[PDB]
Design a protein around this nucleic acid. Structure first.
Ligand SMILES: Nc1ncnc2c1ncn2[C@@H]1O[C@H](CSCC[C@H](N)C(=O)O)[C@@H](O)[C@H]1O
Ligand SMILES: Nc1ncnc2c1ncn2[C@@H]1O[C@H](CSCC[C@H](N)C(=O)O)[C@@H](O)[C@H]1O
Lengths: 187, 284, 284, 183
DNA sequence: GCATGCGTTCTAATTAGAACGCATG
DNA sequence: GCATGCGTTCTAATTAGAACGCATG
């Protein structure tokens, strides 16, 4: 959904739930998170197989849910789709009830770890095509992610598909977080 | 205040056991939307129910809007393919690969069909799969459906072994299973004239013919005119509880019909599970 | 002056059409002795008539004493194989070699079963074969049966061409053939749900599949869901006038069932021929 | 199929019906027919395809019906079974009715022109095994009460090749105890 | 004129029948 | 418990489908 901007004085510190990957030290850099709170507003968890709704409900409320694949490599024990389906599972636990519509956002990013069949189920489950964020500069290093998100932030797959053969990039995810300054406190 | 006919979404419909059981219970069926991929299963449902079933093809192409327009639904049922979940196959690509991941399509559409919270409307659903799966798969499935399964073996009400897991929220799923007056509990009770059953109960019938000859001995289950024989398609229909000749369709032979029947539900088990629905919907 | 049930000798019985027609007419059948060698034909007659038919195997092993012991007979019927009598086969062997000479076995047993002179008791018989034979064979057959044949084409009472010769002494064999209320005269009348017939009548059905698609064009006779299709076993049973699923026996598939149906009699033609027998024998 | 002997004074000239082969000049040698009257007691016919019962009945009563295959060294005009079935056809026309039992006999002979399963059709239709009377041989089916070689011998005898009337006639004699003897 | 058909015979498809398998219960 | 089973793969056949055919009319 579209959410109206907050007046600056009513903005609050985000409560976020980040699965598989931790964006804690990242998100502090943009001031969404504050280094004073020992009980951080970020909850991180990696083995989510035995997480129940009642776990998510008392670890929250949350305003942002973030999930990500392991980086390209890592010797992944789990099938790459597993990170998708589990992220989709909890995200439903964390959504606000219909009768309490608050600003609420979610992001999922993949490290080129998902095949084409997995990406087509990724976009059926998250109800949108991904957007391809590339890394390349004056030395022309090669690195990429694709993101699914309801955040208003938002190339050839020849290049991507042969890139993958030869081998976490926060650099590319971080810029999509800053349209959330219009909803939560800044620094 | 009155009751209206039931509106059903049936994923992986197979040979329309869901519809058959409902019509056999006297429940008025207002809409039956079935997603199914195999052409000869579809022919069976089409011909045997004269076009009452609305077929919509691949479950993975049903959209959130589809669920809005085809619905509302009162009952969402499904039984996903077990090629990659059963330990019967050495090659199992698990819950997350191959066809095992079609389960999540059921989980996905189930959520689309669920009423919103303001709606305290009646809503029932049920998901079935085999028992011969990994404990991790069984754990994750009921992580996603948020409930645990009942095990019901058709041997209590059928002439064959068939142990299955059923998740859902139907009334009384956990109650004891009792045979009814017209259940054919022994193999003899399902054979044609002039055929002798060697056993009273038969091992689990799968899609391949080696499931019909019994145990370590691999013995033919029937004697006719003194020589042993395998089971006939009408006798398979009878064991599973289908009407005789239910699969006598589309020029299918022994193999095709055993495939459809071997992956089917046991009609008397589904009848047991669906029977408490009579008090929530219209009846003829 | 009372009537008793009819006692029948049926040579080359096939799928027991003779018995089926008699039971459909309400005639009490006291004994039905059938000579037949094909195992799947025998399975059909056995299962579909619950053991009322006494099978006696190869016609050439029936003895004069057999006819004495199994009889007396009121009705002797038969239709011998036409592999060597038809023009449809290039390698005809004719009436005197191959299987064409099985006709004389019928001629032979007919004479054993006939009542002796002085016995004015009712005795009826009928022999059928195809029209596509040469005049020499047709002449010799009716030299041996001492009478000439009626030609009856099932196109008048069924959805298919099939012209056959009938010799015999039944009452009224030469009368005109009229359709009854429940004769399915057009191909559409015999198809399953959601299938379209392209023709109203189909060319003569043989045991081989190439007789199902019509004419020079060799066009599939049915349209289903927009695509062309051949006929189904149930649709063949309806064309020939058999009960639906009559041949759904012994795991037979499309080929097996078409073989049995393709060489069988058209039920409504036999009903027409057998109907005058109601006034000579006991009735249900 | 068995008849009491008749006294000699009441014996009468036999009436015979011989099909395919003619035994007329044959049978007169044994005095069954009297060489004299052209309208004999023996009726001969070869092409029986269009003969009806009414033909056989108006050809007058018969006491003996005889049929035989063509000789071996001969053109197979018709299938060898044809002579069998046709012989069986008219023999039934010629039999006396049940209510008129009169000595009545029949004979069928083959020139080794019939294969094995043809012979099994022969003996089920004529209700008896044949007797093989023998280098050359024939086998007869007959109800007249007159009636040592491997069929290996006979079957390889047959291949390398004239009706052998020589051999059939001696089985005809026991009919002298029913019909007149001409000297 | 020349269209049809109670089929036998080729080959190319489907199909049928056993081994193969180990967690789950 | 030490056997069981909503199956895939191999091969051995089963079977399917199209030319082939000419007298009966
Ligand atoms: N992608 C898909 N979309 C819809 N149906 C599918 C599918 N993939 C497989 N199927 C079907 O799902 C079924 C699973 S077996 C279920 C049979 C059914 N419960 C019955 O009672 O008969 C099979 O019929 C299979 O053909
Ligand atoms: N030697 C024999 N003895 C008895 N039956 C035989 C036979 N040889 C062939 N047959 C059978 O004769 C039948 C001729 S087809 C006749 C079918 C029958 N008119 C019906 O209505 O179904 C075939 O079933 C064939 O199996």
């Amino acid at each position: 959904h579209m959410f109206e901007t907050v007046p600056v004085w009513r903005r609050q510190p985000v409560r976020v739930l980040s699965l598989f990957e931790d964006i804690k030290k990242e998100l502090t850099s943009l001031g969404f998170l504050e280094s004073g709170s020992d009980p951080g507003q970020l909850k991180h968890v990696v083995d989510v197989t035995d997480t129940v709704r009642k776990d998510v409900e008392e670890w929250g409320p949350f305003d942002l849910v973030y999930g990500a694949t392991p980086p390209l490599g890592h010797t992944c024990d789990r099938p790459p789709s597993w990170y998708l389906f589990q992220f989709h599972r909890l995200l439903q636990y964390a959504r606000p009830k219909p009768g309490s519509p608050r600003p609420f956002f979610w992001m999922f990013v993949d490290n080129l770890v998902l095949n084409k069949e997995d990406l087509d189920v990724a976009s059926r489950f998250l109800e949108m095509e991904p957007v391809t964020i590339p890394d390349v500069h004056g030395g022309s290093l090669q690195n990429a992610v694709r993101v699914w998100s309801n955040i208003p932030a938002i190339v050839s797959e020849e290049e991507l598909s042969l890139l993958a053969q030869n081998k976490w990039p926060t650099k590319l995810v971080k810029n999509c977080f800053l349209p959330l300054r219009e909803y939560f406190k800044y620094f | 205040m009155r009751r209206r006919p039931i509106r059903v979404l049936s994923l992986f419909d197979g040979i329309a056991t869901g519809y058959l059981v409902l019509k056999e219970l006297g429940i008025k069926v207002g809409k039956y939307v079935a997603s199914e991929v195999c052409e000869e299963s579809i022919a069976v449902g089409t011909v045997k129910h004269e076009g009452n079933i609305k077929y919509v093809n691949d479950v993975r192409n049903i959209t959130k809007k589809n669920i809005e327009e085809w619905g509302p639904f009162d009952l969402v049922i499904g039984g996903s393919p077990c090629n990659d979940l059963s330990n019967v196959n050495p090659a199992r690509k698990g819950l997350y690969e191959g066809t095992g991941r079609l389960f999540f399509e059921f989980y996905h559409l189930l959520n689309y069909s669920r009423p919103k919270e303001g709606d305290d409307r009646p809503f029932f659903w049920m998901f079935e799969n085999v028992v011969a799966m990994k404990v991790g798969d069984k754990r994750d499935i009921s992580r996603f459906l948020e409930c645990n399964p009942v095990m019901i073996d058709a041997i209590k009400v059928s002439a064959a072994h068939r142990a299955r897991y059923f998740w859902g929220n139907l009334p009384g799923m956990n109650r004891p299973v009792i045979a009814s007056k017209n259940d054919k509990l022994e193999l003899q009770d399902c054979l044609e004239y002039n055929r002798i059953a060697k056993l009273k109960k038969v091992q689990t019938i799968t899609t391949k013919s080696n499931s019909i000859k019994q145990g370590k001995n691999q013995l033919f289950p029937v004697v006719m005119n003194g020589k042993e024989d395998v089971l006939w398609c009408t006798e398979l229909e009878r064991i599973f509880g289908f009407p005789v000749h239910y699969t006598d369709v589309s020029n299918m032979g022994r193999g095709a019909r055993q495939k459809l029947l071997g992956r089917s539900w046991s009609v008397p088990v589904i009848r047991h599970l669906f029977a408490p629905l009579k008090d929530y919907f219209a009846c003829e």
